[PDB]
Amino acid sequence: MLIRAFIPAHITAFFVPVFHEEPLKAGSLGAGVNLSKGTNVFASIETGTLERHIHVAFNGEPVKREEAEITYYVAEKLVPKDFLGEVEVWQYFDFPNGYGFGNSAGGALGTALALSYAFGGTWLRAAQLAHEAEVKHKGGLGDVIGQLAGGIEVRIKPGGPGIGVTDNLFFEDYKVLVVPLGRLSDGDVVKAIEVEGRKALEELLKEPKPERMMVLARNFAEKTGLLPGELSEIARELDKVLKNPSSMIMLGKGLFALVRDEEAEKAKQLLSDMNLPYDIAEIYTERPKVGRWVG
């Protein structure tokens, strides 16, 4: 009667937004990584009454539909119009909202998988609806499909579940370091993304490697202006300890870098030394989880 779903946090390395009035045809090209840390969605469902009510919560606290619009958009569709009872969606995040980790995609997909599992449906149907809700409410373009691909994904063909095409890269002994700082809040960069992005992608499909991605990323963030100087400065210090270049967490004020178990502890020192906040998450190589919550 209680369904749990887990969606990994998604961090984009670089990207190219392909906006399209058709949700399923809408998406983005680019590369990202999925963390072992993410969103846990719990769907509680009880039959009864003479009324149909859906309730949503973020980290234990109830949320108005105006702040949960994406999750409600999904729930409204997945919960039968003639259903009588109460549906509760409890979402728990491991990262703050608007920090570039893809929480809304997690809430959209987690919700869609948990409810489809309860009220009937499939993975592709649930996946598409979650994608749809993101694009519809300006939630995101590559988080939902990137989370379905898992691990180190690469969106080579723009589109939603069942339509787009993503690939995965191989990697070894890599963990993810993240220095989350905050949110973000010009026509010049739009054309700087169309170019640097498509360039970074083509260059990655030439050398399919994580190292290559981290280099193609660090360039993308700077060659587009997107990368803040205040971040670039934190980067230049981290780099001195990492075999790979840290890069901006796309659309979030922060940085990330793939690191071995050694460079990690070394970087932990430099960062805690700079009075900076950091997190270490493993690369979630698996796929989203949905099932009866049994522990």
Chain residues in the site for Na ion (CB under 5 A): 9, 38-39, 101-103, 106, 151-152, 168
Q: Give the integer Cα–Cα distance in Å for 42 and 45.
A: 10
- Give the nearest distance from C-beta 240 to Ca ion in angstroms: 22
Contacts of 286 (CB under 8 A, 6+ apart): 8, 150
Considering only 19, 22, 46, 277, the residue that binds a second copy (CB under 8 A) is 22
Q: Does 23 bind a second copy (CB under 8 A)?
A: yes
Considering only 202, 230, 261, 262, the residue that binds Ca ion (CB under 5 A) is 261
Q: Give the integer Cα–Cα distance in Å for 156 and 290.
A: 27
Q: Does 172 bind Ca ion (CB under 5 A)?
A: no
Q: Which residue has the tokens 């178990």?
A: 261
Residue type, 16: V
Residue with smaller CB distance to Ca ion, 22 or 76: 22
Q: Does 197 bind a second copy (CB under 8 A)?
A: no
User: Which stretches of 102-182 are DSSP H helices?
Assistant: 103-119, 123-136, 143-149
Q: Does 188 bind a second copy (CB under 8 A)?
A: no
- Give the nearest distance from C-beta 155 to Na ion in angstroms: 13
Q: Does 21 bind a second copy (CB under 8 A)?
A: yes
- Give the nearest distance from C-beta 130 to a second copy in angstroms: 16
Q: Does 279 bind Ca ion (CB under 5 A)?
A: no
Instruction: Read off the tokens for 215.
Output: 């280099």
- Phi, psi of 102, rounded to the nearest 5 degrees: 80, 30
The residues after which the chain has a C–N gap greater than 2.5 Å are: 185
**DSSP state string for 221-277:** HHTTS-S-HHHHHHHHHHHTT-SS--EE-TTSEEEEEEE-HHHHHHHHHHHHHTT--
Which of 19-27, 105-113, 205-213, 286-294 is the region at the interface with a second copy (rule: CB under 8 A)? 19-27
Residue type, 80: P
Which partner, Ca ion, Na ion, a second copy, none, binds residue 99 by CB below 5 to 8 Å per kind? none
Which of 16-24, 60-68, 92-100, 155-163 is the region at the interface with a second copy (rule: CB under 8 A)? 16-24
Which partner, a second copy, Ca ion, Na ion, none, binds residue 261 by CB below 5 to 8 Å per kind? Ca ion
Which partner, a second copy, Na ion, Ca ion, none, binds residue 102 by CB below 5 to 8 Å per kind? Na ion
- Give the nearest distance from C-beta 241 to Na ion in angstroms: 25
3-state DSSP percent of the chain in helix, strand and coil, to 5: 35, 30, 35
Query: Which stretches of the chain bind a second copy, using CB under 8 A?
Result: 21-24
